């Protein structure tokens, strides 16, 4: 291996010599295996579970429970502090299990999309994992490529390679293949940077930890994850609930002390109530729902790189897509040639190969048989930076189609017969690409310039055109017939490139047009239909012509018979507010630069929407980052996009974006279920103790009974409600608004109904057993079992807000069944098992008492089912 500054200093042949690097053909299988045995794989060694377990204790509510347990052991109450500790342990353990499983499934899916590169080893260019690179191997750099290892570039026809990840400067750096005598390495392609423009070939000088900038990646792995917005808003909700409960419980302590009661019993009851009503399981249930959504998208094949996406996908309503790479498979092919004179050539065959003849007037043309078709093909061949090596394209698909056309014409060799002194490279702002070239053998020939691009810019740069091999000044009737043919090509679905060639820019000769057919991606039509039917709008932001964009959108189904399409120049002309009004009506945006695409994304974000931009292409990373949800394509996608994206579709399907929206929808509903259950039962217990202190009645519950209740209503029975599956009715619902608004008037009203029924039934049992005016253990036992059975019925009815219990079914939620079974068993143990009787201050009951308690406590289930049916019938 060599240092990068050394490899910059020494010449290319020297660097090839030290690594025994064959620049033309690469390292064979044995040459690599040897360097793999010596140097090893390219991975950054091995990337802590106990750190995660302790990190789950960073939640403030867990600290509030730990402080209560510390206060418990101060005034020693072993049983209370132990109970609070078990509560913390089960909630933290369930959060650990869910987070660990989610992150391991995410790592496996990330293994399903490995880093890759184009490496030539046996003289043949192959797709080889960046992990498998050994030093001295020959790697070919395309456009939009992450550099697989530290490389020594020995061929750089044109190269712009950003350095924002490594250096911190967003400006791309040009790389020249000349040796650099004595960050500033203008010849070394670093590790982890991205190729913005051009083609290259290099030899790798480092593998593994040998990379100079491996440390910024070391920091990137250990960057950690900031708290999710929901995780900040449900944390604030938990603090609000905790502080309201603190005020109420302090008032209860003061009332109980003033009215006359045991200070130790009052303090223990206050500590148990504080532990109860603090939503310790609320951040845990948010974490569980986010992790479960992450795994559910992983089963849907979507690499969710960022956690704040999982919730945001529920709120997504507008999806802005790109024609090429996203709505079309990007398998371009030039099929129709329109010569400037008016002749028409039909290029048969498909794919990036030289297989398929060009037919003009029913006759095959080869070489320079027709000089004008040959001139079009020659300009297309020379102008590209894309190469079809071993039947595999490197560069852009639109350039590769022109290369394959040249190979079909027998004229692929003209690329190497010219010397590209100056290059005006493609930018989406430009919409054209030009090259200055001189013929090899004919050095006396002038610096002829080849040009290709969008018809508008090309025809603007041409002052002359060609006619029967004669240069003629451009005429407006010819411009009109070219415009008609370009529009007719686009209306058939052909992407159209116009081609020019001449001495000096601004004086080129317009040779003609080529029609690149890009079929729309299979499965996009049906997914678009479903996506629109589910209340999500799909738009087509593009840089291509109106005719092509509209033809593709009509075939996909997002452009109806009466639909609006707006060019990017109008969007530039219209203000942001006018764009904001018009933008929900426009389905197709054509001729939009990445600045215009960002303008469209900003204008839909200003309307109050969550935009999910799906992107492909090097310049489309800024819009993917600017979107609320950047979505990339795992298989047919550049690494530039997949780095900037937020969710990566592994199998390249638009149905996955719907599934990611459905899973994001379900998370908020599950959190609503937890919130309603915990709040109803905590208000029930809190007002029971409040009424008991106010009316001077004996306390229906002691401190350890409230601690068992807290383990019930924040532990596995309450977490089960956050594991509750999603129903179909909320699936087709209009998109959730991006504000949280978790506690709605309907939810609080049902909470108060459940709290009122629980308090009423439990106080009725308490008074019924207290009618004899004797405070026997049996009475407190009946009251405690009443509250616990009320809790299990409130949990049966808290699973779904709208759907009835019987329609949902008991077998639907397995964790809920296990949790309620364990809670019933624990309650039976507290009633019957004599040591548990001694600690909980209980006494055994008859079977008839349990039957009566079940019958009474069914009231919350009955009333909740009644309200569900009433709301359903009112909706119907």
């Amino acid at each position, epitope marked *: 291996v060599l240092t990068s500054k050394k490899a910059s200093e020494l010449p290319v042949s020297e660097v090839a010599s030290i690594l025994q690097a064959d620049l033309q053909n690469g390292l064979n299988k044995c040459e690599v295996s040897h360097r793999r045995a010596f140097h090893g794989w390219n991975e950054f060694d091995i990337s802590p579970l106990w750190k995660k377990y302790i990190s789950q204790f960073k939640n403030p509510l867990i600290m509030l429970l730990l402080a209560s347990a510390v206060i418990s052991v101060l005034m020693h109450q072993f049983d209370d502090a132990v109970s609070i500790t078990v509560a913390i342990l089960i909630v933290v353990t369930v959060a650990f299990v869910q987070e660990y499983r989610s992150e391991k499934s995410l790592e496996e899916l990330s293994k399903l999309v490995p880093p890759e590169c184009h490496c030539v080893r046996e003289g043949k260019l192959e*797709h080889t994992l960046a992990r498998d690179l050994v030093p001295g191997d020959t790697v070919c750099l395309s456009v939009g490529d992450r550099v697989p290892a530290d490389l020594r570039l020995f061929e750089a026809v044109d190269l712009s390679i950003d350095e924002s990840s490594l250096t911190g400067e967003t400006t791309p750096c040009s790389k020249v293949t000349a040796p650099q005598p004595a960050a500033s390495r203008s010849n070394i392609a670093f590790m982890g940077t991205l190729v913005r423009c051009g083609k290259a070939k290099g030899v790798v000088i480092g593998t593994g930890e040998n990379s100079e900038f491996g440390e910024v990646f070391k920091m990137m792995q250990a960057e950690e994850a900031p708290k999710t917005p929901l995780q900040k808003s449900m944390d604030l909700l938990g603090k609000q609930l905790s502080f309201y409960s603190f005020g109420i419980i302090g008032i209860i302590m003061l009332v109980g002390w003033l009215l006359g009661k045991d200070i130790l019993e009052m303090f223990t009851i206050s500590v148990s109530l504080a532990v109860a009503a603090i939503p310790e399981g609320l951040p845990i249930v948010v974490t569980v729902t986010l992790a479960l959504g992450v795994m559910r998208m992983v089963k849907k094949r979507a690499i969710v790189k960022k956690l704040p996406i999982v919730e945001t996908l529920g709120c997504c309503n507008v999806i802005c897509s790109d024609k090429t790479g996203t709505l079309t498979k990007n*398998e371009m092919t030039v*099929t*129709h040639i329109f010569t400037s004179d008016g002749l*028409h050539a*039909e290029v*048969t*065959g*498909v*794919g*990036y*190969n030289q*297989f*398929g*003849e060009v*037919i003009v007037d*029913g006759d*095959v043309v080869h070489g320079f048989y027709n000089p004008a078709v040959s001139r079009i093909v020659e300009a297309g061949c020379v102008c590209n930076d894309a190469v079809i090596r071993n*039947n*595999t394209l490197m560069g852009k698909p639109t350039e590769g189609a022109l290369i394959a056309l040249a190979m079909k014409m027998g004229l692929d060799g003209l690329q190497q017969d010219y010397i590209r002194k100056a290059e005006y490279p493609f930018s989406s702002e430009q919409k054209w690409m030009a090259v200055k070239c001189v013929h090899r053998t004919q050095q006396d020939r002038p610096e002829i310039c080849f040009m290709k691009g969008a018809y508008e810019q090309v025809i603007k740069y041409c002052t002359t055109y060609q006619s029967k091999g004669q240069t003629l000044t451009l005429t407006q009737q010819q411009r009109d017939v070219y415009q008609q043919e370009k529009a*007719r*090509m686009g*209306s*058939a*679905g*052909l992407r159209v490139l116009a081609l020019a060639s001449g001495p000096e820019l601004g004086q080129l000769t317009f040779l003609g047009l080529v*029609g690149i*057919i890009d079929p729309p991606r299979t499965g996009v039509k049906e997914a678009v239909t479903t996506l629109i039917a589910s209340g999500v709008s799909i738009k087509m932001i593009t840089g291509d012509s109106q005719e092509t964009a509209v033809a593709i959108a009509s075939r996909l189904g997002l452009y109806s018979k009466t639909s609006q399409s707006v060019s990017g120049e109008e969007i530039d002309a219209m203000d942001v507010q006018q764009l904001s009004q018009i933008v929900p009506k426009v389905a197709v945006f054509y001729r939009a630069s990445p600045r215009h695409k960002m303008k469209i994304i900003k204008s839909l974000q200003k309307n109050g929407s969550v935009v999910a931009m799906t992107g492909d292409g090097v310049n489309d990373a800024v819009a993917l980052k600017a979107a609320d949800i950047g979505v990339a394509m795992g298989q047919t996608g550049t690494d530039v996009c997949k780095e900037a994206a937020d969710m990566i579709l592994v199998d390249d399907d638009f149905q996955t974006i719907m599934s990611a929206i459905e899973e994001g929808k379900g998370i908020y509903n599950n959190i609503k279920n937890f919130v309603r259950f915990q709040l109803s039962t905590s208000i029930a217990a809190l007002t029971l103790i409040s009424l008991a202190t106010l009316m001077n009645f004996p306390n229906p519950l002691n401190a350890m009974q409230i601690l068992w209740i807290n383990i019930i209503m924040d532990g596995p029975p309450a977490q089960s409600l956050g594991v509750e599956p999603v129903d179909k009715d909320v699936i087709r619902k209009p998109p959730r608004n991006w504000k949280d608004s978790i506690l709605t008037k309907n939810l609080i009203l049902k909470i108060l109904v459940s709290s009122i029924i629980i308090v009423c039934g439990t106080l009725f049992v308490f008074w019924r057993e207290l009618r004899d005016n004797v405070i026997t253990p049996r009475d407190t036992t009946m009251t405690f079992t009443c509250f616990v059975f009320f809790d299990m019925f409130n949990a049966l009815s808290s699973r779904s807000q709208t759907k009835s219990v019987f329609e949902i079914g008991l077998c639907s939620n397995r964790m809920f069944c296990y949790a309620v079974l364990g809670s019933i068993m624990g309650q039976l143990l507290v009633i019957y098992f004599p040591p548990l009787q001694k600690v909980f201050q209980t006494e055994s009951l008859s079977i008839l008492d349990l039957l009566f308690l079940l019958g009474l406590t069914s009231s919350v289930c009955i009333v909740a089912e009644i309200i569900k049916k009433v709301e359903r019938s009112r909706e119907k």
Partner: nanobody, 121 residues
Framework: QVQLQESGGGLVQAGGSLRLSCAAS????????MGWYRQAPGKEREFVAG???????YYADSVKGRFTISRDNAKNTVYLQMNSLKPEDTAVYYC???????????????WGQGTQVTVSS
């Protein structure tokens, strides 16, 4: 509209002979170009063997000298023979036919449903 049907696919051993047939509903007279394409997972579809308008037969450079093609309008079916196949070059095969147009610029390209051939070592 012409309909393309693929047949003859099946399991064959190395060193044997494999038959494939692609039948078209319409008479194959005006169709200029027609040939097979090899699609494999992890890579783009690649050419197999085809015949063009000027009686010129195109073969893939890697599969050259081994795969043979023929056409007959009596049974309106193009007929492909695999000889001395390897386990490495097995994948799913699609027969595709193009037609000459020219006011409409829509490509008259017709694909087949495809038949999968799997050969192990």
């Amino acid at each position: 509209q012409v309909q393309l049907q693929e047949s003859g696919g099946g399991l064959v051993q190395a060193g044997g002979s494999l038959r494939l047939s692609c039948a078209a509903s319409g008479s194959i007279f005006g169709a200029d170009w027609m040939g097979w394409y090899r699609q494999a997972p992890g890579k783009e579809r690649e050419f197999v063997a085809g015949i063009g308008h000027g009686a010129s037969t195109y073969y893939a450079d890697s599969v050259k000298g081994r795969f043979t093609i023929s056409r007959d309008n009596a049974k309106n079916t193009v007929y492909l023979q695999m000889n001395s196949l390897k386990p490495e070059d097995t994948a799913v095969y699609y027969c595709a036919v193009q037609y000459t147009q020219y006011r409409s610029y829509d490509s008259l390209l017709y694909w087949g449903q495809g038949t999968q051939v799997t050969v192990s070592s």
